Amino acid sequence: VDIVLNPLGVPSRMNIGQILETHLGMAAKGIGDKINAMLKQQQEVAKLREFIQRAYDLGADVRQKVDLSTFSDEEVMRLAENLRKGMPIATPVFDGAKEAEIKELLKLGDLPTSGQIRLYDGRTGEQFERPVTVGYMYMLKLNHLVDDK
Amino acid sequence: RDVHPTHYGRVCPIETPEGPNIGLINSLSVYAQTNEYGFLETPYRKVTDGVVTDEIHYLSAIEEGNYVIAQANSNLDEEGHFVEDLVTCRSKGESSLFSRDQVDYMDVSTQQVVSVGASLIPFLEHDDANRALMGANMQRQAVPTLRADKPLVGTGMERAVAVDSGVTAVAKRGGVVQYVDASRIVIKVNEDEMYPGEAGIDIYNLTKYTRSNQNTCINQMPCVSLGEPVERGDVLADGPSTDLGELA
Amino acid sequence: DYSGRSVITVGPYLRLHQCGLPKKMALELFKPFIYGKLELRGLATTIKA
Amino acid sequence: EFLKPRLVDIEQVSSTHAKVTLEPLERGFGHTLGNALRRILLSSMPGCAVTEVEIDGVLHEYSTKEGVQEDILEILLNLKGLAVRVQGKDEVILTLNKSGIGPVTAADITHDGDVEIVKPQHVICHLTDENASISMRIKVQRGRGYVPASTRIHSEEDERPIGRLLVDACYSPVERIAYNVEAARVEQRTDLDKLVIEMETNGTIDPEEAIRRAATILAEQLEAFVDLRDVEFDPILLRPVDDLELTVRSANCLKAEAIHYIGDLVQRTEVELLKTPNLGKKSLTEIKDVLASRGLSLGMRLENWPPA
Amino acid sequence: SVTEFLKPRLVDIEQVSSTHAKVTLEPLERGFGHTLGNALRRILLSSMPGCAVTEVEIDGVLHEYSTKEGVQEDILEILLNLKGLAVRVQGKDEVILTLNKSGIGPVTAADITHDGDVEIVKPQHVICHLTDENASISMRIKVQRGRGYVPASTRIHSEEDERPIGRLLVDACYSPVERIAYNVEAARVEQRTDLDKLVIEMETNGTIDPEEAIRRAATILAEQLEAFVDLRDVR
Amino acid sequence: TRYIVNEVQDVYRLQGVKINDKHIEVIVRQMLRKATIVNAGSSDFLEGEQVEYSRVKIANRELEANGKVGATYSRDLLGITKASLATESFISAASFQE
Amino acid sequence: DDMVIPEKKHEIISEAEAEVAEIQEQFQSGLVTAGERYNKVIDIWAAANDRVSKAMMDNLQTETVINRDGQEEKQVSFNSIYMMADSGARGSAAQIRQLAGMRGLMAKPDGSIIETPITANFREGLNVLQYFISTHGARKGLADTAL
Amino acid sequence: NGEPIIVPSQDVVLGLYYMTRDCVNAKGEGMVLTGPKEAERLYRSGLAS
RNA sequence: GCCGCGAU
């Protein structure tokens, strides 16, 4: 993992958005890693196009009509090579993805629906007793640095 | 310094300074505009009988204080009728449940209440108001990094914020790109539209490392490679902290 | 004077009576003590040195 | 009483991904060896990475060269990821010259004597006109761990001319490593453990050599535990007193009071050496005169006094 | 430069009693103190050859719940006392011992019948305080050499309940390591300021000095790597 | 004192704050200085005087034969903004208030 | 998944809505004044909120049902959010209720209380109206703390 | 008020609250062991919860 | 020295 954060900061400030965004980021990176694995072995365009199409329409009555039937072949390859890092999904402000959609997206990428995986201690090597939520959070580096203070 | 129930569609209820100036400084909502005299107005969709139409009326405080206004998060049929016979509404600075025919106006979108600063927070409805305020006021202090990185999860509002900020180079009337360099982009316009006589091509001189007000860097790198068609309003160079025309 | 100011972090290895000080923040607050101990041990004779 | 693990069934999935099997292992040693080897392999593995780059027309990393698509910053970031294997040398220079249209890849770098580019499809820059050329020299070294460009100053022991763009070095080839333990296929024994290590590197180091190096490092570190056991400086001082150009009536008096070094004379406060017989008021000022000429003011306080 | 690592120098040993030791090693390269400490602790705790009493027979009733014939200490306490007894047997895999005491007075570990091939390191280790008043106690114990720590999960021996009643499934601690702990602290050398220093606290039941146990763990772990360090050897 | 201590403690105990009563009583003692004299005989009459000064004066007069000179006083209760400003010394109370 | 939603929340929220509709009919009948119906609505909403809080807390406390050497038993839960709440590290009963149970009646425009409460927690979303309503209390609290 | 001001809080409490809790069934039930030393040894060896 | 912005 790249950042370790204190759980005791969530249930007292009521940023459930943190946890939901973390689960959603894990789902998006799972889809991106699946696409990257498909692209590494240079599979044919048919199955890659089918996977992209099946990934895009997932949802519950979503107002998104991206279809790759009208998409050019080299354009499809460019799209895959562009989002190989992760499918950049977006949720508008007050009508977003519910837990059902997030869990469905996680299940598409062969990931636990609960969003929590088991972790091992880096130094001792013993498994952590409880599952831990591992996800991707978008972090900002603020302009209050040290050398200026 | 308090949130008046008339701040609904005109002034953001979340974003504001914290300590001294709490509530004395505001940020306009995303759809709010100014009347001829200078009173804030917000747009609504007209309701005729039980069907909602696509006509948009701009209403001020006084005019909206009399009608009955529906809610954006209300289920809508295929043709335009309200699915439910009872609809949540605001009558006069309040809220209640009205009949399917008693409504007069409908909210246009769910982002109307909030400004543009707090519209880029995913899952805003799952945050406490104080923490949303802190996040909104702290997103403005981020610094541009070495390599811009798109957000893996967002609210789609990145495109408008990035393009409209004037920090990116958008092709005004471009055709097909001809010469791409680390500092210059020369585009040859399409045959369809020209100014008669003397022909013409578009030349954009990107601004390289330049001191900003807070002693940060301002940089522009092209995103088009060569021979790439470019439509009107396309994004050719991304300024500081923006990836392919998306705020990052 | 003889005063400094900086951001604080957490140290879980510390004892109840210890605090970590940046060695760049020291060597400024304790400069006269360094001068005295240098002139004492003979590394430098004059104050300019 | 303990079976000795052996290296067997080593296979490679790709040019980078590799799997290594250690079939004979006892009950608890699988996890211990796995974690120790993972930490050793991730922490300190010798490798080679680009140290510095000199481009013909640039002056600093924040410039733009005409005819290329990328800034010099992005070129340096691209070069930082270059993967190259060297043999018998540690300061090898790589030159790259190309003129034309299109991407310029690692395969264009001139073929050195003993230098292997693990991947040649690694694009580093793009040339976007017919008459633009790129000519650059890369000095690549051999190292152990991550060393920032800023933290190295010994490279400035010799003054570097303007035009030398210093880049950070990584030196670590092992990008990722995981281990696993399974029940062995041996049926004669009651139950045995088999350890499987998967490593994804940049291709610079062979997997088997990496496992051997990690084992040797662990053994060398254990060699300490295999046997516990264990159960007044500045040149101006330390200088004889017979050089201050002193008078005759001072020399005999100076020797009479066991003052043989310059330093012990300095440690004499004014009010006390006047009690010396036949010191002389005018003479004492002369001692103060010539001693202050060296900058040693009378009355200094030292800590310890060596006899030499 | 490359393939040259800092070796710890001037190890310090503070000895408390004859079974407690504190070993301080410095300097170790970053990320090595933790590795060495964990490997040594895991080896010392999980697999370390040693001997401990494992089977107990008491005259009278043989049930797990016993009246203890008025021996003023429950048979559970007797088994707990017998758990911690430390012995030294040379060259025999399994050995049977017998103890028999009559008369008022607490019984000690020295009461067992004298035999040359097993030595007792804690002769005054109390087992019981006699069967209250005016009675006798007879115990037949069986001690075998094992590895690490093995609990009383089940007998899985002999047939039916013969072995469980013949041994009473006394929990055995084979490894002579009562407690092992390791800490890693910050230390600096010359210009370097990020180095790891190891503090090992070791307490043993006896029969072996803590330094000897550390040496044995180090030797077995080093010999585990002979197949890889043989050809890739400096000498 | 019991009146003031009990009511001011209700504010702190309601929100869950523990503060010992000795700290409140110290403030009250500083609040009960500057007694007013209701009699005469010792160069004091119908005036506000520090209780400490009055106490040493009566003890001195009572120690002497003229015990009747000791004049009965009337204690006052001022505010902490007024009591802090009626400090005998003028360097203090001129660095805090008007 | 730690914020377990009580299952009976919807049943009793519907019961409260039915009672509110009945009292609105009573007000329309004219035998009740505005103050009486307002106060009765406030009281019944408080009762329903307390019942939701009790239901959520009971479902979260002994939620874990782990078998024993014989048959099955029940104990105190190991839920991470409940572990944080109970141990006193961070959080409290009110915050936990806001996370899982109903948010509850709230209003601070001039000190009064809106008749309709916030019936959605933070595990689910909020409508625009509910967020706008909570903003009153947030801003008032921030200003009071500042001043 | 006389209450101790330096007190464990935040993760520290969760360190002890998690440590001093019981479960109706775990690794090792009704086991009898000599003392805290054996408890630590059993937990570290992975034989008990 | 006066505003304006900002952190706790």
Curated annotation (Swiss-Prot), chain A:
Co-administration of salinamide and rifampicin or salinamide and myxopyronin suppresses the emergence of resistance to both antibiotics. Acetylated on several lysine residues in the presence of glucose. The modification N6-acetyllysine is found at residue 107. Belongs to the RNA polymerase beta chain family. DNA-dependent RNA polymerase (RNAP) catalyzes the transcription of DNA into RNA using the four ribonucleoside triphosphates as substrates. Resistance to the antibiotics salinamide A, salinamide B, rifampicin, streptolydigin, CBR703, myxopyronin, and lipiarmycin can result from mutations in this protein. The RNAP catalytic core consists of 2 alpha, 1 beta, 1 beta' and 1 omega subunit. When a sigma factor is associated with the core the holoenzyme is formed, which can initiate transcription. The rRNA transcription and antitermination complex (rrnTAC) consists of RNAP, NusA, NusB, NusE (rpsJ), NusG, SubB, ribosomal protein S4, DNA and precursor rRNA; S4 is more flexible than other subunits. In pull-down experiments interacts with CedA. This is DNA-directed RNA polymerase subunit beta. It comes from Escherichia coli (strain K12).
From Swiss-Prot, chain E:
GO terms for cellular component: cytoplasm; cytosol; cytosolic DNA-directed RNA polymerase complex; membrane; transcription elongation factor complex. Residues 159-162 are annotated as: Required for interaction with Crp at class II promoters. Keywords: Acetylation, ADP-ribosylation, DNA-directed RNA polymerase, Nucleotidyltransferase, Transcription, Transferase. GO terms for biological process: bacterial-type flagellum assembly; bacterial-type flagellum-dependent cell motility; cell motility; cellular response to cell envelope stress; DNA-templated transcription initiation; intracellular iron ion homeostasis; nitrate assimilation; regulation of DNA-templated transcription elongation. It is an enzyme of class 2 (transferase). Changing residue 42 to C: In rpoA112; temperature-sensitive, blocks RNA polymerase assembly. DNA-dependent RNA polymerase (RNAP) catalyzes the transcription of DNA into RNA using the four ribonucleoside triphosphates as substrates. This subunit plays an important role in subunit assembly since its dimerization is the first step in the sequential assembly of subunits to form the holoenzyme. This is DNA-directed RNA polymerase subunit alpha. The chain holds residues 4 to 238 of 329 of the full protein.
Curated annotation (Swiss-Prot), chain H:
Co-administration of salinamide and rifampicin or salinamide and myxopyronin suppresses the emergence of resistance to both antibiotics. It comes from the Bacteria. Acetylated on several lysine residues in the presence of glucose. DNA-dependent RNA polymerase (RNAP) catalyzes the transcription of DNA into RNA using the four ribonucleoside triphosphates as substrates. Belongs to the RNA polymerase beta' chain family. The RNAP catalytic core consists of 2 alpha, 1 beta, 1 beta' and 1 omega subunit. When a sigma factor is associated with the core the holoenzyme is formed, which can initiate transcription. The rRNA transcription and antitermination complex (rrnTAC) consists of RNAP, NusA, NusB, NusE (rpsJ), NusG, SubB, ribosomal protein S4, DNA and precursor rRNA; S4 is more flexible than other subunits. This is DNA-directed RNA polymerase subunit beta'. The lineage of its organism: Bacteria, Pseudomonadati, Pseudomonadota, Gammaproteobacteria, Enterobacterales.
